[PDB]
Amino acid sequence: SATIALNKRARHEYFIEEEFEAGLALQGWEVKSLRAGKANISDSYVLLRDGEAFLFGANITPMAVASTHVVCDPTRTRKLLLNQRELDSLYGRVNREGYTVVALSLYWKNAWCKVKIGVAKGKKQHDKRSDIKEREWQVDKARIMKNAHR
RNA sequence: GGGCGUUAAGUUGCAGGGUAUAGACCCGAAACCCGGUGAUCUAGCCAUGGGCAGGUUGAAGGUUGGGUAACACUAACUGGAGGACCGAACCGACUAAUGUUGAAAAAUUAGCGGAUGACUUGUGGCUGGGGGUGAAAGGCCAAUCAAACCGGGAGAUAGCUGGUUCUCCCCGAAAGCUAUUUAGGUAGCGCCUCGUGAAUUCAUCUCCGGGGGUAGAGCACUGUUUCGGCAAGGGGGUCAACCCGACUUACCAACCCGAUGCAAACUGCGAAUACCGGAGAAUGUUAUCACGGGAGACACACGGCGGGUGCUAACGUCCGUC
RNA sequence: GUUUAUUAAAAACACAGCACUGUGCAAACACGAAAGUGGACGUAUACGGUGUGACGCCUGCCCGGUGCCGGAAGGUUAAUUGAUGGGGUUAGCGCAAGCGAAGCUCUUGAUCGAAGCCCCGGUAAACGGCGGCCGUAACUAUAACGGUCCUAAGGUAGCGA
RNA sequence: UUGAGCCUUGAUGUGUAGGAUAGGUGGGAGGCUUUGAAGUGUGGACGCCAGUCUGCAUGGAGCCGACCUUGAAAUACCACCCUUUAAUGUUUGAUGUUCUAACGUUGACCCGUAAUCCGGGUUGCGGACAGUGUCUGGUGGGUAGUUUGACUGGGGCGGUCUCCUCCUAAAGAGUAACGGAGGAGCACGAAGGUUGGCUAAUCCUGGUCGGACAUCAGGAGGUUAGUGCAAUGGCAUAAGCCAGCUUGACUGCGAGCGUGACGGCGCGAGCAGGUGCGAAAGCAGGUCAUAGUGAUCCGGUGGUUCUGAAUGGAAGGGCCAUCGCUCAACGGAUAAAAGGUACUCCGGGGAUAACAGGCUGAUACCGCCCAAGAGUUCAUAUCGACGGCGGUGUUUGGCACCUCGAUGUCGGCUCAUCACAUCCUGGGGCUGAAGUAGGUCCCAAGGGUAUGGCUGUUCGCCAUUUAAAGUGGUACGCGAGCUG
RNA sequence: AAGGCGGCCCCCUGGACGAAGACUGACGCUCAGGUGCGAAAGCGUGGGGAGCAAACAGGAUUAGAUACCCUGGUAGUCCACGCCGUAAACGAUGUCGACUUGGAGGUUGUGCCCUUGAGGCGUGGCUUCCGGAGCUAACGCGUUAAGUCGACCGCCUGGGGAGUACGGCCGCAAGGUUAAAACUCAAAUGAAUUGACGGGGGCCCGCACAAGCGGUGGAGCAUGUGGUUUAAUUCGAUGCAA
RNA sequence: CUGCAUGGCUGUCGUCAGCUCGUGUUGUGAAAUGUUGGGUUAAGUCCCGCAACGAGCGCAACCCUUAUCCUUUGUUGCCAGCGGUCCGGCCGGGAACUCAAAGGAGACUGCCAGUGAUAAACUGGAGGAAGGUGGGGAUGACGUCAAGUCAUCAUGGCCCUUACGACCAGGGCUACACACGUGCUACAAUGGCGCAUACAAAGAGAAGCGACCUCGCGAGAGCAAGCGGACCUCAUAAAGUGCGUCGUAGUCCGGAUUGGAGUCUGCAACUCGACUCCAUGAAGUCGGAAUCGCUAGUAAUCGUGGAUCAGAAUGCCACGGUG
RNA sequence: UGCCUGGCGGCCGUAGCGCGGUGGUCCCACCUGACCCCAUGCCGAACUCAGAAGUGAAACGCCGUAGCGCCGAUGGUAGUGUGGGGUCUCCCCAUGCGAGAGUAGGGAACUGCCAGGCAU
RNA sequence: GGGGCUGAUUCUGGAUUCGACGGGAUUUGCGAAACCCAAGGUGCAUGCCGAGGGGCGGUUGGCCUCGUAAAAAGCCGCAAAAAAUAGUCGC
Ligand SMILES: [Mg+2]
Ligand SMILES: [Mg+2]
Ligand SMILES: [Mg+2]
Ligand SMILES: [Mg+2]
Ligand SMILES: [Mg+2]
Ligand SMILES: [Mg+2]
Ligand SMILES: [Mg+2]
Ligand SMILES: [Mg+2]
Ligand SMILES: [Mg+2]
Ligand SMILES: [Mg+2]
Ligand SMILES: [Mg+2]
Ligand SMILES: [Mg+2]
Ligand SMILES: [Mg+2]
Ligand SMILES: [Mg+2]
Ligand SMILES: [Mg+2]
Ligand SMILES: [Mg+2]
Ligand SMILES: [Mg+2]
Ligand SMILES: [Mg+2]
Ligand SMILES: [Mg+2]
Ligand SMILES: [Mg+2]
Ligand SMILES: [Mg+2]
Ligand SMILES: [Mg+2]
Ligand SMILES: [Mg+2]
Ligand SMILES: [Mg+2]
Ligand SMILES: [Mg+2]
Ligand SMILES: [Mg+2]
Ligand SMILES: [Mg+2]
Ligand SMILES: [Mg+2]
Ligand SMILES: [Mg+2]
Ligand SMILES: [Mg+2]
Ligand SMILES: [Mg+2]
Ligand SMILES: [Mg+2]
Ligand SMILES: [Mg+2]
Ligand SMILES: [Mg+2]
Ligand SMILES: [Mg+2]
Ligand SMILES: [Mg+2]
Ligand SMILES: [Mg+2]
Ligand SMILES: [Mg+2]
Ligand SMILES: [Mg+2]
Ligand SMILES: [Mg+2]
Ligand SMILES: [Mg+2]
Ligand SMILES: [Mg+2]
Ligand SMILES: [Mg+2]
Ligand SMILES: [Mg+2]
Ligand SMILES: [Mg+2]
Ligand SMILES: [Mg+2]
Ligand SMILES: [Mg+2]
Ligand SMILES: [Mg+2]
Ligand SMILES: [Mg+2]
Ligand SMILES: [Mg+2]
Ligand SMILES: [Mg+2]
Ligand SMILES: [Mg+2]
Ligand SMILES: [Mg+2]
Ligand SMILES: [Mg+2]
Ligand SMILES: [Mg+2]
Ligand SMILES: [Mg+2]
Ligand SMILES: [Mg+2]
Ligand SMILES: [Mg+2]
Ligand SMILES: [Mg+2]
Ligand SMILES: [Mg+2]
Ligand SMILES: [Mg+2]
Ligand SMILES: [Mg+2]
Ligand SMILES: [Mg+2]
Ligand SMILES: [Mg+2]
Ligand SMILES: [Mg+2]
Ligand SMILES: [Mg+2]
Ligand SMILES: [Mg+2]
Ligand SMILES: [Mg+2]
Ligand SMILES: [Mg+2]
Ligand SMILES: [Mg+2]
Ligand SMILES: [Mg+2]
Ligand SMILES: [Mg+2]
Ligand SMILES: [Mg+2]
Ligand SMILES: [Mg+2]
Ligand SMILES: [Mg+2]
Ligand SMILES: [Mg+2]
Ligand SMILES: [Mg+2]
Ligand SMILES: [Mg+2]
Ligand SMILES: [Mg+2]
Ligand SMILES: [Mg+2]
Ligand SMILES: [Mg+2]
Ligand SMILES: [Mg+2]
């Protein structure tokens, strides 16, 4: 479909409950590479300062060096396109010393790039172990039930 | 009304210039097909007989001894197998020299490889040319092979190359346009010659009418460009040195006006020459036009003039006039 | 060993070994319009063809495409056979144009109709093909790793200006 | 097992009207009852379950028939029989099981015979198979006949092949290049004809959204807008924009003229017939004009005042209108076509290339001119930016002028000449020249001006000497002096 | 003997035990080298190949899953002759001799008793479980000793480096065998004890679920916390237990 | 400032039921028995069996409240009986009762059957207000969380003595875009509205609670008697009950926001309390994942008192009504 | 015959704009209202059909203004057809034709038909 | 050194990035700079030489002054020398 580079390592590391389909504001070469040219969404987080929740973590492979007059770099703070109705939640519940906002996926909608973002906490090894334990234990319990029922 | 006719004599022989089919001015192909001849050279195969001097290496195997229950294994004697080794005859030609109208249309000289086998050789036969054969090189098939030789079609074709032989007199060009599987050929026209007819037909000069829009010139229009005024003012301010910024900071800056230039694809204007028509004398062997017979030719070059292209470079190239 | 007699004797051909394929005999194949012959007076441990070429380690992935084989569920489909439509002719109807039954004709072609092709699968020791792009590790430097466009796969073992 | 004529239609039905399974037109009514009627039941059933062929066990004798709801009169009747159903005798096209007499036998025996060919006889096998003859679909470089264009500042590649607009095009017409610039392979029954009416682009002011922008009112300006399209030439009488009517976007001609070698193309007053608009005078044979396109042959369609192979028709042909070709290589070879040859060959060319020679010198080398400066101040002792003018032919370049009826080109060995823009030696000037030793410039060609490793070298790197191991032309010297 | 051996039948053959009988007369045990056998996997030749199944293909879970799972699938597993000689080749216990309390069996002989039942009393061979003395660090062994001895062979001397490299041998190969050194470390270890944990098992309790009831999360209202802003938003509490 | 030096105090596991010691025994020894196993339970409660025998902290009981009865003593608490009435406990009087607060009796598996191991213990029941702890509260082990407080207080170092110390005025803890937590109002016809009308308990009161009269639509204001309080006040409790009214509605539903003018306490409510009138009438119209408490007078629903307090609860702590 | 007005033409940039103010006794324009018969893709903005209350206010026309637009000499220059030359990417001479722009200057139009209204 | 394909999520001529962040214009209160003024109050100033300024220095020299010139204080610099910055992550 229209799905482009998505971060699933963050999806595993977090248990995000927030889903905003906010868009992104980009320059020319950015959308050039996003259409084809491998914009990378790995290691993504927001940098809310004023009303300026830049997507700080995002890489990209430039299409070419056609724009030779001015030298650009892949490491740019891409801005965000989100409603002020929902921007208050980020103005609020982001500073909890243990809460972050990360980008899950990036896709196309009528030739406009929309990057999904979500609020998460962060999982440390001892709860990932419990999550995997429960995931495998549900399967084991269902298998045991089927074997007992025959 | 328009096209073709209605004026107008043709025909048969002779000779001559053409045209069409027959070879069609002559010499010359590489090539195709058909019918025959070759395996005595060479390539393969079959059948029958010869050749490999001489000198080395010790595998299988067979005995004796040790050893094993029997083997297996081990020591001694015989053994002479190898697409085995060196090297003669024989076969071949890897290197260098000689020679290149030579001794010889592939050899000689001094070296070289195989030399008991996938070897070599004598005799006879078999394999036929779009086929044969080929330890595979497009190699050989009788000094000739990416399709052998003889004869026939056949004097194939050749828009190609060369040649085309006695004399005199008169006239006398082109290397241009169009079309072309066309560009070095050809066909029509432009140009030439001969004959028949025809009008002051044609040419030079003088006068008259008309078209220009090229030189030159100019910026009314389409583009380009410079310095001034009207201005919005910005950019390092001298100065505060943090100021509103006092202010012009070797900067840029819409229209509007005043000047200065450029243009093949600009012309509010605009020549000479070039070209057509009307009138007139003088001169020119009708030099002008129409038809018919016959061609030749469509590879041009230089200089002068106005130019594109090139470097206003070329004995360079492309156009128009002499 | 053989090879271009007569400028190339070699890395060029052959070779034993190995792989695939067809071949049940009146075998495949080849020469022959045919008879017939070779294969072979042989019988799948044999013959022919195609690849590589003693021997040691191996022949890794892919049938997208072209060949080959297996199947005929569906579509198309020759030759063959001939259901209708139309036209010609006229015995006769028509005071006239015009109708016009049989017989003979030219034409369209209803239906039947195999192989083949379309389709499914296998076959690579069949013809063949086997990726680029970016970031990321305690200074430099690289990338174990990940993100993702495409393919049939992205080149394994081994070797390397 | 099996296809339609075939013994029979055993048969179907229905306005929401409904004893409803309606009488073919002409006759509306027993032909039924000995042309065997409703009777009891409850397979199968059409099924709008109101019903319905209701079919069929023992009967031995009446259902209907008026039509009730009626827009249609019972199928209980004479019924070329329907919105449609069925089994067996008539016909034999396939897939099969079985037999031998065709056919085959490179199974066995015997004979001709003395004979592994052949033929005949006997006996077995396969068997209407295989195979062969004609047609036919597929496969089919195993083999054959062929094609693969031109222009081109040598060929190939790149680009072009037709038409139109501007300039080169030198003030009539025409006029070339692989010159500079753009388009065309259409659209429109209105975007045409007539009549009537009308005149923008741009800018300024005022005004509700409304804005650098619309729709309005006034003004500046006069074609700086517009043409269905690219460009040129025009358009105010408007060719530019609307409204009403219409099809002249007609038929057959056509004096004359322009442009082309020709095939051809275009303009055109006016005549005859019939139309449209306008009261009328008058206009209309397409579009403001120039691109919007393709010969011939072969065939298709409709009419024909024709032709009709003895007659009468017909078939066919001709005539008129018209259709089927990115034949774009566009004056179009045929309906039907790609490459390699270093295994090549033939006829030619220096008309046409590569090595050379000639011409010019963009480039190459060298010289000179003015001066921002570098150089502790200081432009010249050395250099010199931004710019310019020249010499040689000397590299890379352009032309194709001699040579393709033959001029052998790279490099290496031997053999040298000449130039001076001189490497050294020789003679001098300046110096940012103290001396030794250096930088630059002038004159001066008398002489000299390496050895080895690398690669086939020229060039170059390296090692070691010398005063240097200098630059060029000599067909980038020299193969009728040598190799390769 | 070990590895190992499972329908039935036949052919050849090795080994073990017992009833009674006679001789042979120390011929007896172990074993460095050496030889032979030797699970499976593996390699060569010639076959076979139903099922299973490395490698491999596809699907699936997962952030990733080159695995566990699913659908296919080659070598292999099978036969004959050959090659290596590796295993947790384990009883982690080298062969033999005799001595040292018992119980419950299993298998297989043999003597005698009234064999009325797999009735009893003795004696042998193999083997299982429990256990006394004894032994061991403990677990545990315990007449088949890990109890006390005798004869012989092999091996061990800290964990890594390493049973690694080199070297000799064997082998077609994979690899096997003999076997170090430099360097680092203060430990590396085994039996058991007490906690703790288990996606180990068993039992039990609590509004912890199951059957309710009402609320919270939805929209203002009264509070505290985090961040924001300010000169301060004074400080502390920051899971259930703020 | 250091609760990462502490004393003291407190939360959690958990009102879970375990945590230990003396002697003896077993194993060289860390250690084990006792504390496991069988019934039983609210429970290491009890019994049985057993290298165990006993004890301590512990799960129970003793402690506080309430559920029945008896007795002692009746004012400010009550009227069985009588008299009168101003019909009112009014007071003479009556000390049985409702009640006041002291001591006892009383529930102890005591008994009766069944079950079990001849036990412990369990099931049912004649009695009782009561049945297995009758119903609630206090009582919180060994110990874990460097758990929270050095800002209640004390305390060891460290830090300042012209300043981190001392005094005063004005602002801030109550704050512009949000999130989270605990409660309240609610959503409506089970309801709000207008007018009558009963049913409680527990507490407070001395510069304090504050009767009555009058002005007040009102918070309240002048007047104030009584009360150190079974006397007098705070303080006609609400839900309900009677009657109409509202008919599923931007509602006579929700009273959040906002404007006008005041009432009480406080030198002084703009930052920053509350009550009262008029009007305005935000949402909402039963709430997504995921969640919280409760097993009987408990969950819900209604009202009141009290703590610090000049005033300020929708919070906290307790009584009750219905249930 | 002279004033001015109307219609049709010739001449179409000395023939056209800007400024000053006049014209009505005539002719024209403005205008009145409008059922007709005609008209607006809405309105008598335009066509018109019935007329003269007023005005020359806008137009139209006339007279002067040199601010403009234009017409533009002589002379000079550029160019060149022929012939002859140099130092030849360009130029000289003998010859005729001789521009464009810019100076001097001109300039506020002439003229033919009828149709009326004016003095004669 | 020269040709062809891409520079299109659309090839087919008309995307509101739905949102925050520039810019426009429309509907609201005001401050002589979003206004143009000396009239109520009836005080001692406009300007005239102005002194160097919070701890330090300074602005058109007057925002702060007055008597015949001096402290200067309404702002700007030193200064606030909380700008040290998601989640995961050792002793
Ligand atoms: Mg020929
Ligand atoms: Mg040929
Ligand atoms: Mg030999
Ligand atoms: Mg040899
Ligand atoms: Mg020789
Ligand atoms: Mg020899
Ligand atoms: Mg030899
Ligand atoms: Mg022969
Ligand atoms: Mg060949
Ligand atoms: Mg060849
Ligand atoms: Mg031949
Ligand atoms: Mg030939
Ligand atoms: Mg011939
Ligand atoms: Mg000839
Ligand atoms: Mg002559
Ligand atoms: Mg030619
Ligand atoms: Mg003549
Ligand atoms: Mg000309
Ligand atoms: Mg002629
Ligand atoms: Mg002629
Ligand atoms: Mg020509
Ligand atoms: Mg020609
Ligand atoms: Mg020629
Ligand atoms: Mg020429
Ligand atoms: Mg010329
Ligand atoms: Mg020239
Ligand atoms: Mg020239
Ligand atoms: Mg030429
Ligand atoms: Mg050899
Ligand atoms: Mg040779
Ligand atoms: Mg044969
Ligand atoms: Mg090979
Ligand atoms: Mg090999
Ligand atoms: Mg392969
Ligand atoms: Mg396939
Ligand atoms: Mg097939
Ligand atoms: Mg078929
Ligand atoms: Mg292969
Ligand atoms: Mg290597
Ligand atoms: Mg004979
Ligand atoms: Mg048969
Ligand atoms: Mg071929
Ligand atoms: Mg073929
Ligand atoms: Mg061919
Ligand atoms: Mg050509
Ligand atoms: Mg011309
Ligand atoms: Mg008109
Ligand atoms: Mg008419
Ligand atoms: Mg046109
Ligand atoms: Mg033709
Ligand atoms: Mg006829
Ligand atoms: Mg016909
Ligand atoms: Mg055609
Ligand atoms: Mg052509
Ligand atoms: Mg030749
Ligand atoms: Mg020539
Ligand atoms: Mg040359
Ligand atoms: Mg020459
Ligand atoms: Mg200087
Ligand atoms: Mg020389
Ligand atoms: Mg010199
Ligand atoms: Mg000399
Ligand atoms: Mg001399
Ligand atoms: Mg030389
Ligand atoms: Mg010579
Ligand atoms: Mg036996
Ligand atoms: Mg041994
Ligand atoms: Mg095995
Ligand atoms: Mg399987
Ligand atoms: Mg599997
Ligand atoms: Mg095997
Ligand atoms: Mg071992
Ligand atoms: Mg072992
Ligand atoms: Mg032994
Ligand atoms: Mg045994
Ligand atoms: Mg034991
Ligand atoms: Mg090893
Ligand atoms: Mg689990
Ligand atoms: Mg006027
Ligand atoms: Mg003049
Ligand atoms: Mg002039
Ligand atoms: Mg002039």
Side-chain angles (χ1 to χ4, degrees):
Chain A
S1 60
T3 307
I4 322 292
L6 56 94
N7 193 6
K8 42 188 174 181
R9 188 177 186 270
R11 181 75 174 183
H12 167 69
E13 287 271 336
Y14 301 113
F15 46 93
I16 315 182
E17 194 65 281
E18 293 177 350
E19 310 293 338
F20 295 152
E21 295 85 357
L24 195 144
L26 64 80
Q27 289 79 7
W29 49 275
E30 303 264 16
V31 70
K32 289 188 227 178
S33 299
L34 193 41
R35 276 292 188 177
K38 295 302 147 295
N40 194 337
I41 204 180
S42 61
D43 192 10
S44 57
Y45 69 92
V46 307
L47 199 60
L48 275 66
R49 294 158 54 183
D50 299 345
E52 304 298 332
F54 302 147
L55 184 61
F56 191 93
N59 196 33
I60 195 167
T61 84
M63 170 71 70
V65 291
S67 59
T68 320
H69 51 280
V70 56
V71 180
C72 60
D73 49 351
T75 61
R76 197 190 68 87
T77 62
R78 286 83 179 180
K79 206 173 300 181
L80 193 65
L81 266 281
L82 184 57
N83 296 114
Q84 196 69 19
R85 172 64 160 88
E86 286 73 18
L87 202 50
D88 54 0
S89 300
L90 303 180
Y91 287 153
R93 48 173 183 178
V94 73
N95 297 120
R96 288 177 175 261
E97 295 294 80
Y99 268 69
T100 180
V101 180
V102 296
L104 282 174
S105 306
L106 174 57
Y107 54 93
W108 291 100
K109 284 297 299 179
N110 296 332
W112 303 108
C113 57
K114 310 303 179 180
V115 63
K116 210 173 192 61
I117 186 167
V119 184
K121 301 186 58 181
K123 282 196 300 182
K124 40 193 62 61
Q125 294 79 8
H126 68 77
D127 61 29
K128 303 194 193 69
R129 289 165 58 94
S130 63
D131 189 12
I132 299 180
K133 164 213 186 74
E134 178 69 286
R135 177 212 303 171
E136 188 69 287
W137 189 77
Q138 277 287 155
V139 161
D140 296 330
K141 174 173 53 58
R143 183 179 301 156
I144 289 300
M145 170 58 181
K146 180 180 178 181
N147 292 16
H149 197 190
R150 293 176 180 178

